[PDB]
Amino acid sequence: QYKLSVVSGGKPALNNLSSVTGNKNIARLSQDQRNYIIPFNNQIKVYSVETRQCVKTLKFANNSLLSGIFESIVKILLGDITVAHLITVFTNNGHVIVLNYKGKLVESPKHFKISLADEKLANVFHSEGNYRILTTFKNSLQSYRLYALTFDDAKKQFEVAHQAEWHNVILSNISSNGKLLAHMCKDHKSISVVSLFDDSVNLSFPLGSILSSQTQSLSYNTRYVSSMAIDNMGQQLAVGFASGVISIVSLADLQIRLLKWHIDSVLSLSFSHDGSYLLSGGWEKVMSLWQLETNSQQFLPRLNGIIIDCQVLGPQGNYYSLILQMTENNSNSDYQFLLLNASDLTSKLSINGPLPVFNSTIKHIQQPISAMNTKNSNSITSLNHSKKKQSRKLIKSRRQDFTTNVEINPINKNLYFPHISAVQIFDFYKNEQVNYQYLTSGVNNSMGKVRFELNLQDPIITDLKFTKDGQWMITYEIEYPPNDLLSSKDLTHILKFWTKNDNETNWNLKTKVINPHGISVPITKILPSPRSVNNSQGCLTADNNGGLKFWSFDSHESNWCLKKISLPNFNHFSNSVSLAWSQDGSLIFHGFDDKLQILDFDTFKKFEVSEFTLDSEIQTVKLINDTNLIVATRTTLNAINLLRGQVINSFDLYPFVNGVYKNGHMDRLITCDERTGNIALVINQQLTDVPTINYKSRIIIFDSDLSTKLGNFTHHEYISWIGWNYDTDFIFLDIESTLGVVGTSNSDIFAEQLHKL
Amino acid sequence: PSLSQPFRLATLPKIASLSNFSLQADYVQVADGTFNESTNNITLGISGSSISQYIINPTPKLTFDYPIPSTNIITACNAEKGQANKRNVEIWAFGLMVNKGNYTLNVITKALFLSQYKIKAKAKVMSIKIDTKNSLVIAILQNGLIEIFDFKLTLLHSFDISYDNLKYAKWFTENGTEYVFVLCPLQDDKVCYKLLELTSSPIKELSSTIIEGFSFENSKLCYQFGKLYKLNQGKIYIYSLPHCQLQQVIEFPMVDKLSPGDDLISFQPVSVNRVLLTVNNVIYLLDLLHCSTLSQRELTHVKTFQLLKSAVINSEKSHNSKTIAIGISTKNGPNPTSSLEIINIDVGTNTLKDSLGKSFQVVILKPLFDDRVKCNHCNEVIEKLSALQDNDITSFDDIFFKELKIKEEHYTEKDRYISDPGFLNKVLDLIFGKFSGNDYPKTLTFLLTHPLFPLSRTRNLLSLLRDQPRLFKQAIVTCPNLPLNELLEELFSIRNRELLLDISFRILQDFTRDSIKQEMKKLSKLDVQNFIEFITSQSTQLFQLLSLVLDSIGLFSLEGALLENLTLYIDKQVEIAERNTELWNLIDTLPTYTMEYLDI
Amino acid sequence: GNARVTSGDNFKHVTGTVTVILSQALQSNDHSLLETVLNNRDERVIRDTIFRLKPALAVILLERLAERIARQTHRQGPLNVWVKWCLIIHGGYLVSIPNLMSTLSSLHSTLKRRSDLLPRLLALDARLDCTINKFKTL
Amino acid sequence: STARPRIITTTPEQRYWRQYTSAQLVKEHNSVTHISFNPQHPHDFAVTSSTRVQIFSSRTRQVIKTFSRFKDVVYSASFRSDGKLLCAGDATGLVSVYDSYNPRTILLSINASTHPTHVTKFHTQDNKILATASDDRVTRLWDISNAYEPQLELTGATDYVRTLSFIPAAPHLVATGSYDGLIRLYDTRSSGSTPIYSLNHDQPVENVIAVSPTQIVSCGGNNFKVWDLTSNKKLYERGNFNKAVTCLDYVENFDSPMQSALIASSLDGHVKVFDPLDNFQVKFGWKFSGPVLSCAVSPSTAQGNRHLVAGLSSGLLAIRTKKKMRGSEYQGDQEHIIHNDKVRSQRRMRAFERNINQFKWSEALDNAFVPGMAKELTLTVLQELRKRGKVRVALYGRDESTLEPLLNWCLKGIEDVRSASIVADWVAVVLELYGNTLESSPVLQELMIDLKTKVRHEIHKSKEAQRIEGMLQLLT
RNA sequence: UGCGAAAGCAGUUGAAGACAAGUGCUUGUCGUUCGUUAUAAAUGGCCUCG
Numbered sequence A: 001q002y003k004l005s006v007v008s009g010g011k012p013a014l015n016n017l018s019s020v021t022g023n024k025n026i027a028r029l030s031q032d033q034r035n036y037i038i039p040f041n042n043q044i045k046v047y048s049v050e051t052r053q054c055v056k057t058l059k060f061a062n063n064s065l066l067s068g069i070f071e072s073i074v075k076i077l078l079g080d081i082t083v084a085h086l087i088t089v090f091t092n093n094g095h096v097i098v099l100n101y102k103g104k105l106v107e108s109p110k111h112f113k114i115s116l117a118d119e120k121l122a123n124v125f126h127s128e129g130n131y132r133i134l135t136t137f138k139n140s141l142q143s144y145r146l147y148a149l150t151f152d153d154a155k156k157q158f159e160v161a162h163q164a165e166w167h168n169v170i171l172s173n174i175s176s177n178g179k180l181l182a183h184m185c186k187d188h189k190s191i192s193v194v195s196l197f198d199d200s201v202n203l204s205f206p207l208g209s210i211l212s213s214q215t216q217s218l219s220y221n222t223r224y225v226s227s228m229a230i231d232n233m234g235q236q237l238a239v240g241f242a243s244g245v246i247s248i249v250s251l252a253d254l255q256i257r258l259l260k261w262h263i264d265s266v267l268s269l270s271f272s273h274d275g276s277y278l279l280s281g282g283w284e285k286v287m288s289l290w291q292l293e294t295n296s297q298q299f300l301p302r303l304n305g306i307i308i309d310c311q312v313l314g315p316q317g318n319y320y321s322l323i324l325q326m327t328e329n330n331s332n333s334d335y336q337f338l339l340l341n342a343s344d345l346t347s348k349l350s351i352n353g354p355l356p357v358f359n360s361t362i363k364h365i366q367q368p369i370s371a372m373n374t375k376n377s378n379s380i381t382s383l384n385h386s387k388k389k390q391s392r393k394l395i396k397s398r399r400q401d402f403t404t405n406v407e408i409n410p411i412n413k414n415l416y417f418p419h420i421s422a423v424q425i426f427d428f429y430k431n432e433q434v435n436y437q438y439l440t441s442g443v444n445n446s447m448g449k450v451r452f453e454l455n456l457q458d459p460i461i462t463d464l465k466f467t468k469d470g471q472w473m474i475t476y477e478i479e480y481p482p483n484d485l486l487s488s489k490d491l492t493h494i495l496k497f498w499t500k501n502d503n504e505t506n507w508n509l510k511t512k513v514i515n516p517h518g519i520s521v522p523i524t525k526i527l528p529s530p531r532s533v534n535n536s537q538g539c540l541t542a543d544n545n546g547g548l549k550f551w552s553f554d555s556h557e558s559n560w561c562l563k564k565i566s567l568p569n570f571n572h573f574s575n576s577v578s579l580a581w582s583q584d585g586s587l588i589f590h591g592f593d594d595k596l597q598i599l600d601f602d603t604f605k606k607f608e609v610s611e612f613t614l615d616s617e618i619q620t621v622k623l624i625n626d627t628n629l630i631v632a633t634r635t636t637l638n639a640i641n642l643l644r645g646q647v648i649n650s651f652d653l654y655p656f657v658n659g660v661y662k663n664g665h666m667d668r669l670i671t672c673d674e675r676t677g678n679i680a681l682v683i684n685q686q687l688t689d690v691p692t693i694n695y696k697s698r699i700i701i702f703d704s705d706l707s708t709k710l711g712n713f714t715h716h717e718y719i720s721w722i723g724w725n726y727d728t729d730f731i732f733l734d735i736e737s738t739l740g741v742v743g744t745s746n747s748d749i750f751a752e753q754l755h756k757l
Numbered sequence B: 001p002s003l004s005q006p007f008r009l010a011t012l013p014k015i016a017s018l019s020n021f022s023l024q025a026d027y028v029q030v031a032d033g034t035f036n037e038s039t040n041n042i043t044l045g046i047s048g049s050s051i052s053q054y055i056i057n058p059t060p061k062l063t064f065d066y067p068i069p070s071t072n073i074i075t076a077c078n079a080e081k082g083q084a085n086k087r088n089v090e091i092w093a094f095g096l097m098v099n100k101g102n103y104t105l106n107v108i109t110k111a112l113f114l115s116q117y118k119i120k121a122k123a124k125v126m127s128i129k130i131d132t133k134n135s136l137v138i139a140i141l142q143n144g145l146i147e148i149f150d151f152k153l154t155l156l157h158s159f160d161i162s163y164d165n166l167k168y169a170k171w172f173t174e175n176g177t178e179y180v181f182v183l184c185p186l187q188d189d190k191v192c193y194k195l196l197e198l199t200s201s202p203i204k205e206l207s208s209t210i211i212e213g214f215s216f217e218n219s220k221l222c223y224q225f226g227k228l229y230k231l232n233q234g235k236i237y238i239y240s241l242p243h244c245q246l247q248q249v250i251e252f253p254m255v256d257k258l259s260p261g262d263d264l265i266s267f268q269p270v271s272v273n274r275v276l277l278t279v280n281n282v283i284y285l286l287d288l289l290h291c292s293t294l295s296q297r298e299l300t301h302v303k304t305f306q307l308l309k310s311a312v313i314n315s316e317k318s319h320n321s322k323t324i325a326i327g328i329s330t331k332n333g334p335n336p337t338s339s340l341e342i343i344n345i346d347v348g349t350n351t352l353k354d355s356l357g358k359s360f361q362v363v364i365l366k367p368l369f370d371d372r373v374k375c376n377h378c379n380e381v382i383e384k385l386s387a388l389q390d391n392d393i394t395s396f397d398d399i400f401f402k403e404l405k406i407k408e409e410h411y412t413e414k415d416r417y418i419s420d421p422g423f424l425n426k427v428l429d430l431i432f433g434k435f436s437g438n439d440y441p442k443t444l445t446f447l448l449t450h451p452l453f454p455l456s457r458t459r460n461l462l463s464l465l466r467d468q469p470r471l472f473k474q475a476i477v478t479c480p481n482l483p484l485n486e487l488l489e490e491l492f493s494i495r496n497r498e499l500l501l502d503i504s505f506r507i508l509q510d511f512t513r514d515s516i517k518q519e520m521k522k523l524s525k526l527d528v529q530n531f532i533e534f535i536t537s538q539s540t541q542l543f544q545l546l547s548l549v550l551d552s553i554g555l556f557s558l559e560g561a562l563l564e565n566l567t568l569y570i571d572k573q574v575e576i577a578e579r580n581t582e583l584w585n586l587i588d589t590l591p592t593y594t595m596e597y598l599d600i
Numbered sequence C: 001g002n003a004r005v006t007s008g009d010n011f012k013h014v015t016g017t018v019t020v021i022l023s024q025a026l027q028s029n030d031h032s033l034l035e036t037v038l039n040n041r042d043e044r045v046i047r048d049t050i051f052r053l054k055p056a057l058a059v060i061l062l063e064r065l066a067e068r069i070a071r072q073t074h075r076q077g078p079l080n081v082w083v084k085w086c087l088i089i090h091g092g093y094l095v096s097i098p099n100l101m102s103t104l105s106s107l108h109s110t111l112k113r114r115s116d117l118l119p120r121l122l123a124l125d126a127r128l129d130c131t132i133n134k135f136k137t138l
Numbered sequence D: 001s002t003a004r005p006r007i008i009t010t011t012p013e014q015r016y017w018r019q020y021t022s023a024q025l026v027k028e029h030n031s032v033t034h035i036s037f038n039p040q041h042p043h044d045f046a047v048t049s050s051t052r053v054q055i056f057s058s059r060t061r062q063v064i065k066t067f068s069r070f071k072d073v074v075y076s077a078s079f080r081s082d083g084k085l086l087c088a089g090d091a092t093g094l095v096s097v098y099d100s101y102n103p104r105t106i107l108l109s110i111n112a113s114t115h116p117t118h119v120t121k122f123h124t125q126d127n128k129i130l131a132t133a134s135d136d137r138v139t140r141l142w143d144i145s146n147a148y149e150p151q152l153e154l155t156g157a158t159d160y161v162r163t164l165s166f167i168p169a170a171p172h173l174v175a176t177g178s179y180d181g182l183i184r185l186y187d188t189r190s191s192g193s194t195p196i197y198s199l200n201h202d203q204p205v206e207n208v209i210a211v212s213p214t215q216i217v218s219c220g221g222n223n224f225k226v227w228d229l230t231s232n233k234k235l236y237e238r239g240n241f242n243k244a245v246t247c248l249d250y251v252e253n254f255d256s257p258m259q260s261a262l263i264a265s266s267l268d269g270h271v272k273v274f275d276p277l278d279n280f281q282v283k284f285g286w287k288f289s290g291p292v293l294s295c296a297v298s299p300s301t302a303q304g305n306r307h308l309v310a311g312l313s314s315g316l317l318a319i320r321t322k323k324k325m326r327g328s329e330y331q332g333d334q335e336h337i338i339h340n341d342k343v344r345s346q347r348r349m350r351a352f353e354r355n356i357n358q359f360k361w362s363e364a365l366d367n368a369f370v371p372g373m374a375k376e377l378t379l380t381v382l383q384e385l386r387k388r389g390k391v392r393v394a395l396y397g398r399d400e401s402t403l404e405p406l407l408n409w410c411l412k413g414i415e416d417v418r419s420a421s422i423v424a425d426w427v428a429v430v431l432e433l434y435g436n437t438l439e440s441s442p443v444l445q446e447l448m449i450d451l452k453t454k455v456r457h458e459i460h461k462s463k464e465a466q467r468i469e470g471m472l473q474l475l476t
Numbered sequence E: 001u002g003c004g005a006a007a008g009c010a011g012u013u014g015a016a017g018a019c020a021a022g023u024g025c026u027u028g029u030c031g032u033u034c035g036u037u038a039u040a041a042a043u044g045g046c047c048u049c050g
Helices: A064-069 A213-217 A382-396 A451-455 A665-669 A746-756 B378-386 B393-404 B421-434 B442-448 B469-478 B484-493 B497-510 B513-522 B525-536 B539-557 B560-588 C019-028 C031-038 C043-052 C055-071 C073-095 C105-137 D012-018 D351-357 D361-368 D375-388 D392-396 D400-413 D417-433 D435-440 D442-475
Strands: A003-006 A035-039 A043-048 A053-059 A073-078 A086-091 A095-100 A120-126 A131-137 A143-152 A157-166 A169-174 A180-185 A190-195 A202-206 A225-230 A236-241 A245-250 A255-260 A266-271 A277-282 A287-291 A296-300 A307-313 A319-324 A336-341 A347-352 A415-417 A422-427 A432-438 A460-466 A472-479 A492-499 A508-514 A525-528 A538-542 A548-554 A559-566 A577-581 A587-592 A595-600 A611-613 A618-622 A628-633 A636-641 A646-652 A677-685 A695-703 A709-715 A719-724 A730-734 A738-743 B007-011 B028-030 B041-046 B050-055 B061-067 B073-084 B087-098 B102-111 B115-121 B125-131 B136-141 B145-150 B155-160 B168-174 B177-186 B190-198 B203-211 B219-224 B227-232 B235-240 B245-251 B265-271 B274-279 B282-287 B292-298 B302-310 B322-331 B338-346 C004-007 D022-027 D032-037 D045-049 D052-056 D063-067 D085-088 D094-099 D102-111 D117-122 D129-134 D139-143 D152-154 D161-166 D173-178 D182-187 D197-200 D205-210 D215-220 D223-228 D233-238 D248-252 D260-265 D270-275 D281-287 D292-297 D306-312 D316-322
Touching (some): A035 A073, A043 A347, A169 A225, A180 A225, A460 A525, A508 A559, A525 A577, A538 A577, A665 A719, B028 B073, B028 B302, B041 B073, B050 B073, B087 B125, B087 B136, B125 B177, B227 B265, B265 B322, B274 B302, B302 B338, B378 B421, B421 B442, B484 B525, B513 B539, B525 B560, B539 D442, C019 C043, C055 C073, C105 D442, D032 D306, D045 D306, D117 D161, D139 D173, D161 D205, D173 D215, D260 D292, D351 D361, D351 D375, D361 D375, D375 D400, D417 D435
Parallel strands (some): A266 A307, A577 A618
Antiparallel strands (some): A086 A095, A143 A157, A266 A277, A277 A287, A336 A347, A415 A422, A472 A492, A492 A508, A525 A538, A587 A595, A595 A611, A618 A628, A719 A730, B028 B041, B125 B136, B190 B203, B235 B245, D022 D316, D117 D129, D129 D139, D173 D182, D205 D215, D248 D260, D270 D281, D292 D306
């Protein structure tokens, strides 16, 4: 009956090598400069630059060769090496595959395999028919080898020959022309620049010569280099420093020139083709174009995220390619690729995948390096300790929630991600983002945080829901006071109601309630009202104190109003609360701690059994249909018939759900259809002979009353979340940012010749 | 929802045809026109006696009567008010069959007799509809003929459904247009269903279907809002118009036990998805959508009660939840007497509130997955414990803890499989029966800590455990859903300081300020003084409780002499508390000429 | 934009006496006449005027005091004594009222906000007294 | 790239009447009895004062015509619907008709009665007929053609009749209210002279007005009541007024957020607007020096600035008014492709906003504490600096000379509830940052002592606040 | 760092290797490792199109 199928895409793919800097971007612009090619973690997207739309998409699953092969793409080369709309993809393991775009994907591409002996392919490059490949072999520093690659037509094989070798490579970068390589080694350290296809350039010198004596006197941050850039001609080399100082060095005589505007560690440096211009970007969320001739600078401020990489892409420097990080989301690294114009500094193409916020960090994501160790960044020393601590947390600890809230829009079926202090509106039918809107106050895009400012925490959008009609948005936000202040412990709770007419794309704030339910009391749960009550313009808000508050939109006041209240001043606190409303809207089920309560809506108090006691705290209360109520407690789940007041089925969840999830995540994991049945999700940890990072999930389709399992399917990764689309199908989000769905003649020759002409 | 006591409308005459109680409802006809939600009048045809119109409120009274010969049987009767050529009038149309030799269709016009007319009908009249707008009387016959006459009984039209032996015909209006559907038996339990629209021919056939497996001889039928309800062998079959397809089947277990032949069953509709079912002298108000028994009433003073007709509420459009129904009740005794009785019915709000916990339909943990990953016999125990001798604590605990593999004297997250309430409640009984006085087993301590401690045994639990302070302390801390009334009484009765503190915290945690106050008003005026005097002699919870105490007693009842101590006492802590707050924060908190002494 | 702010405590939709002037001002909603009456700062006058004020008009005075305090918090104290005596004199009458929270919601909210200042001011004064005790001895 | 976010800093019905800001107080020589508005543009309004009637230009708000022929005191200045004719009564009982804007010529003179004629109103439906009321207690209905005999002489009033009204859409009905407390309704094509029915007001009737075809509002004594003719009973009644209500007028379909408004004079110096759509509930009011005898508003189709007029027994007239390169202009009407990309410049930012955008933390704090600066705006800049995480930074480079301005406001802002928490935030930092500088500076120490006296006082108020919260729990 | 409510209740912050500086000894560091649940500070601030 049911079947699972991946629908959307995932993150853009990056050359995630620590040593490589200035070459993270792997997306390439076509020779004709009419479309941009970007490899994702699971697909390859070709976007026509003129129209700014995904003209073509290549899914690895569709082709058997890519399905088996996909390992990540290390580079793309326009055209075919072996031999007008072909491309050659090189992956880390060494698979060289020639595929086609602007057309139909052939099920038999020219798959090849380069021979590498314990070498991980890192980069490849070419100037004119000559191909060199950089490879990695293993003091926590990787060593690199430069080989020559040629294709022999007799054997149809890629032969590899040795050219050069460097050891303990710390940082590396390649020129824009792809003909010079600059790198740093510990043999404190030394910089060496070498020509790749020729012996013309071969220079080396200790780093200390470039470093100023004052830099020696000051902290390590001043001596800590964060970025490298090399001019095409090889005369100029730009060094970045964590302190934010740029040093341009003339290779001819090792003469230094200081350019100092960045207040925080500079992340991206790139020279222009001519060399008179320098693009610089860092934590400031601002690009600086440095006029080297007069040491002047032009600014492109207020980016979406901090700049990881910069590059000039064009025969005359027509386009700039940018990588943005969105450092606010500490849990996950959100990369966005931006293609700007030198002419007017406008976005000709912005691309980025879904941007969920998980409760905790996942896999091996590490915060970018900064001048200091902060919440959104890591210091120089903090990197290794943080990496080890992250690994040991994923290994030994038991709390592995990684659960993200997501919302579905009934009217449009768009997906809403409550990103930090913002909402990302994304279309999974088109697999393209449609909007990014800030729902809160706070320092979000006014300015770029640097140094201690980075410790500031922006407002957190914890809950985001739609009404049944879909014309209204309810959002709940938490304001964190700044630290080191008397009022450093009074978190503020804010509720907002928004409305949007269907044609527009921007939601408008209609009402704001400050400190709902009182002061310092979180809104643990929110539930939109059913269509029966106030034709889908009412809602319920529930606390950890058992207080229930029913708001409604009244036409005469023209806004939302507080209609009903029930404030039982319980003396105990618990974040485990759940709320459900009948389809008719007559009765309300409120589960607080270990105790479920039935309330008459009209009087908004106990019905006149109203109390059901549970073994443990209740995480989820939902009614699959008007007759049956499924209640999940921290240890198990039980199906109860309100009509009989008796349990039909009981399933034991403790072996899988003990301390792995914080209370309230079962709400967003468990989903229910209003016609056919519900679904239960369980992720679990895999191992062979101590814990390993990889995760495996199982989805079970259950009928109303849980008598039978309609289906049992398995996914090979941690499914972060599921929701029930208003259609019969259910949509599930996977920690690789993957959204899948589980659901049920002379004239003819004359014409040809004229068309060619 | 509720059912009112039946009140008599009239006493049925002692006629031979009416003597057969089982068929008595067949010999009494209720006019559709005069009997609805808003009408206070009922027109009833009693076969062999008369057609009589009664007013119901304020008191039942006979308003009109038209006599009929005792040898005649009323097969169809209708009455409707309208305007006739214009004078306001009441038109009464009735059919009388005499010995099957002749059938008489009779129409009477009365001024609100203006006229009376009588014709010979070809077959027995099943249903009659009066259209006052067009001044038409439409009569359906058992042979399948639908004849449209004027008020003068002049035949204007005749339509043939092509099927004889018609058994049921019901009229209904949808979107301002009149409709009628008919049922005609066929052989082999096959049935022809036809739907006809009333507009060359004023009658248009919209649907014609043959429904299989539809028996009549033991089937009770009624229709409501496009749904046809069939009661047979204790199962209610619900069919949807205009093609009469079986949508759902509802099994009603309270009828399957009825022996076939002796029990008298009547079945009529009362509201949307709500029907009236009578089983001899018991009447049931049922909700078919939710399958719940909204109300039940037993008429101890009559042998049987048969529903005749019921005024049906369209609750979807009507705010009114009260209606009436008319039926025949037969008295107990050697000379049974039958009377016409009216029952007032409160259908309700048609919400899931009315149906919760009232179902008329009468566990064990199971693995999630049937079959390289982390892991983050109740009766047998019962009989073993029951087999023990009285006052054997060690054996009782040993069997319970060892058999259940319980490791701790208190409930833990690992003890879930024991959570089955049936097993626990039996163990509670064994502990009570086996052990009395001052010694109870350690098993009670474990059960006390259990979240699912039975509510039935919560009452008096503090009284049972008063003799052992340790058990009493445990009951305060973790025993679930302890009645507030007992704790309030124990709060003002116990003199131990520690127990007083523990009780108060439990009250504030588990009960609202409002819930505490009302019961706390009941407490005697002297007892509160003792508690207050205790205070004058973690504490903020007690002070909050005292704040409640001052709340319930009221400004009148406070006696000025005692308050003198309280303000001086209460002020004694405000100065202390203010002092403590001040301490709390603190712990959180060149010259032109100089003389200096050089060291050399 | 034009969205309005609101607080969760807004439970709205859930001789020498001047008594005659006060009663007329309250009945006629004459703010200027009510203002001059409120200007008196002599406590004995406040008690006597409220003493002779009819219980029915005493209720609406509470709302008038609530709104005026809300608009100008600096008048909270001087108008606090007024509401103090209204509850004192007409406490029994207020008890025999079907509903109080809805009609006195503004007083609830206005009164609550003042209390929330108390915890922080004590912290402010405690840090502040420490410094003052520092230089005074030095 | 995105534009920099901008720093973020009653009823809609109430805001409407506040726009009548300009108030001109003119002095007349006697009590102004009646005020009328001309039904057409320029909608100049007429005032009855002493022995003359004065017409005031709407725009100029000054007298343009004066009618002084009347020997005795004047009692009416009502226009006919067309506005060409103006009728007025006198104590002698003579009723005179003047062509509007032509005071010299008498168009028609009738002696209604020997007794005073207090009301003279043209019939709104019919031009020819004119209605007059006299102390004779007979409300004669005169006609322009017939100046020697009334067409109808309505009677039945046992006291002075000083209120005549015509029901809109119902020329049937002539409504009269006498000081008997009875409002009498008359039908004209009938024989007349006997009311259709009488409505009891229980108090002398001062003015009767027809709000709608079926709704008649009678303002008499200390309250005004609205009666529905179909039901023949008072639908609503309001008695908020203290003095006896005297005059009342109604305006509909005017550009306010409300569809209609109802203004009623009180004789207490109060004129209040009422909402017919909301059961005639209070929505706005004004106060004047003395009792109000007449009130009026500009008609719905004023076609310009609206006018609110109040008449006082002192003769004071209060008028409140709500005011209402040859190719450079081609605009490319005929061109194929039109492109517009010009972007309006952002609204002018204040000095403090510029500093924050420029990271001038210390100066922004300085801009906060400047003379004639709004208190609320001062909170925003302080809140923003706290929100930005720059509090110690802005307070670092400061001495006593530049520290006092912050403390001064803190001395006053500590009192305010909204700023109390913020004041505690900043005052805490300056102390932990300038404890030593406090030691060597006397002047601040005095600023420090007075801060104790005020913050201590607030503790008493906040303490007292917690006490009263106890009562409000007990009373409920 | 664990748990919990937000308040808080409990518990941690070790060892080795290498380098620099001062005088084999002392101190400080680590794009070095093993194990535990485990101030900052190179004068350096955000564009233009009314």
